């Protein structure tokens, strides 16, 4: 009989079992969605949203509920850091239950369509055999798609009837779910504009309705019926697999690069924000905003939010991870407890020093202390036999400003080397390697894990597009070639 | 007709390809020996790698203003 890899092709001939077998897959996907949301709520720690947020804890599908308005829980807590007085029915646990209740309803529907497979709807008139009108079937489902797209865009995102989406500031500090207005100019194609998301789904929803009305009425061309093999249920599979790896490269691309549909308070910062000095420049923009108005150092560094200094850290970079360094980001370096200050380095000639930060490539990186003009003055040398840039001889002291070590100075050449090696990792933080028994080496955020799956899926679905496009064009020669096929040579 | 072995053995092939082939080799010789290849492709001559401003490797370091910066790195 069939091989092991060909068993599911018993469904290619009868449409009733095709309903039943997509219903079982749909029951498993929403059955995963509720079960993963129940698992994430049962392990989420909502205590510190400032310094232990959801992307720090390994929450994968909880930033997708929170992206579309679900901010409250049936345990009292919220995401923004307050108590929910009325959680409503659309909590995290209400939605985790609404997918399990839907999973059993789709389960029972699949059992129905498996037994009652021989419906009269699936047999076309006056030939009596099982047939599907795939140009009109597409016209139905494209019409429903643009109707939901326009419904999600005009009502859910815009806040006309639904709640809205997540919108934050540029620096990930002040972020809520609030309604957006659509933006119809050139600004709507800036993907860091949330208004272009609402303006997308209205315009693409209206066009998807109008295109759906086309494919409901206008039958295809005969020359384009044969050339795209429209009479097969597999030429829609090949083109749909082509549609979903295209989408999965775009989806994983905007997750990795960052977009308004991927906030950093939900998914963490991007690797291009550590590389391009995104938060470091703003932290310096706010210190220099205070030293110019007239203030002390330790009174200016206290005015920086502890959440902003946590984005400026290599351990929250999604590209400082490993493929088998599994779990939460808190499992790597610990749960962040408090910002420990801003390490400022001075040598014995009264000159400031600046630690060259670890680039994103480097697993290990030598610590270097550069001056204002960019010249190395101190380091922790590898050879200490005849050194000329050692911290011991240059006389590097370290003072902190703000944080838990405010106004405290360290001149001990063992202590200074410890904080110089923490200052190349970013801002200085205090962790606990005892709460989760942390390994000591970093992990990747859900922004990095989502991107890893959805490019590995988008690449394996390129091959499935190649396989299933080949099985439609070469449907007649699937079991082998003809015996007299030697006419193709000279 | 003409299956790759009545061409190479024909003398009319070599009354063409003993004139156009050397004049095209010389055309490639003169494209570089007249220094025009250094101008078309912007590769620096062996006396053009280091001006008096810099004695190090160039570094482009700027995205949208690279067109006039590489004019300043080259020394024009």
């Amino acid at each position: 009989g069939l091989p092991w890899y060909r068993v599911h092709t018993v469904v290619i001939n009868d449409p009733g079992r095709l309903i039943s077998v997509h219903l079982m897959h749909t029951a498993l996907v929403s059955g995963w969605a509720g079960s993963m949301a129940l698992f994430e709520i049962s392990v989420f720690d909502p205590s510190d949203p400032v310094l232990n947020p959801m992307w720090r804890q390994g929450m994968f599908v909880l930033p997708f509920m929170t992206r579309l308005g679900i901010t409250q829980s049936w345990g009292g807590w919220t995401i923004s850091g307050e108590t929910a007085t009325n959680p409503g029915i659309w909590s995290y646990e209400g939605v985790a239950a609404a997918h399990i209740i839907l999973s059993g309803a789709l389960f029972l529907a699949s059992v129905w369509h498996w037994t009652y497979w021989d419906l009269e709807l699936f047999r076309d008139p006056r030939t009596g055999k099982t047939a599907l009108d795939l140009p009109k079937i597409f016209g139905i489902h494209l019409f429903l798609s643009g109707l939901l797209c326009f419904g999600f865009g005009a009502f859910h995102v815009t806040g006309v009837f639904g709640p809205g989406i997540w919108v934050s500031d540029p620096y990930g500090l002040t972020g809520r779910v609030q309604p957006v207005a659509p933006s119809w100019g050139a600004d709507g194609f800036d993907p860091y504009n949330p208004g272009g998301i609402a303006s997308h789904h209205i315009a693409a929803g209206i066009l998807g309705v109008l295109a759906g009305l086309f494919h409901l009425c206008v039958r295809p061309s005969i020359r384009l019926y044969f050339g795209l093999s429209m009479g097969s249920i597999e030429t829609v599979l090949s083109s749909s697999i082509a549609a979903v790896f295209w989408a999965a490269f775009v989806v994983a691309g905007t997750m990795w690069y960052g977009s308004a549909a991927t906030p950093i308070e939900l998914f963490g910062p991007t690797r291009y924000q550590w590389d391009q000095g995104f938060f470091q420049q703003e932290i310096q923009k706010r210190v220099q905003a205070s030293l110019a108005e007239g203030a002390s150092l330790s009174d200016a560094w206290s005015r920086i939010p502890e959440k902003l200094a946590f984005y400026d850290y290599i351990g929250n970079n999604p590209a400082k991870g490993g493929l088998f360094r599994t779990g939460a980001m808190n499992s790597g370096d610990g749960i962040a407890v408090g910002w420990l200050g801003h390490a400022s380095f001075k040598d014995q000639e009264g000159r400031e020093l600046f630690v060259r930060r670890m680039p994103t490539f480097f697993e290990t990186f030598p610590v270097l202390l550069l001056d204002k003009d960019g010249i190395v003055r101190a380091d922790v040398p590898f050879r200490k036999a005849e050194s000329k840039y050692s911290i011991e001889q240059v006389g590097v002291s370290v003072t902190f400003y703000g944080g838990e070590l405010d106004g405290l100075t360290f001149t001990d050449p063992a202590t200074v080397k410890k904080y110089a090696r923490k200052a190349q990792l970013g801002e200085i933080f205090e962790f606990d390697r005892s709460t989760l028994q942390s390994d000591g080496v970093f992990r990747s955020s859900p922004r990095g894990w989502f991107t890893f799956g959805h490019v590995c899926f988008a690449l394996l679905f390129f091959f499935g597009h190649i396989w299933h496009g080949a099985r439609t064009i070469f449907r007649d020669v699937f079991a082998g070639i003809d015996d007299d096929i030697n006419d193709q040579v000279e | 007709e003409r299956p790759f072995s009545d061409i190479l053995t024909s003398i009319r092939y070599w009354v063409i390809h003993s004139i156009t082939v050397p004049a095209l080799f010389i055309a490639g010789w003169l494209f570089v020996s007249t220094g025009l290849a250094y101008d078309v492709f912007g590769t620096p001559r062996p006396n053009e790698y280091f001006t008096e401003d810099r004695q190090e490797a160039p570094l482009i370091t700027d995205r949208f203003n690279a067109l006039e910066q590489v004019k300043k790195l080259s020394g024009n």
Binding site: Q280, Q281, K372, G374 | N65, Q69
Partner: peptide
């Protein structure tokens, strides 16, 4: 003492402040 530009030059040097307008 130090500008915000030549504090992000000796610390990262890939900075979006340090890379743009760097024709000077």
């Amino acid at each position: 003492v130090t500008l915000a530009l030549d504090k992000d030059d000796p610390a990262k040097e890939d900075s979006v402040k340090g890379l743009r307008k760097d024709i000077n």
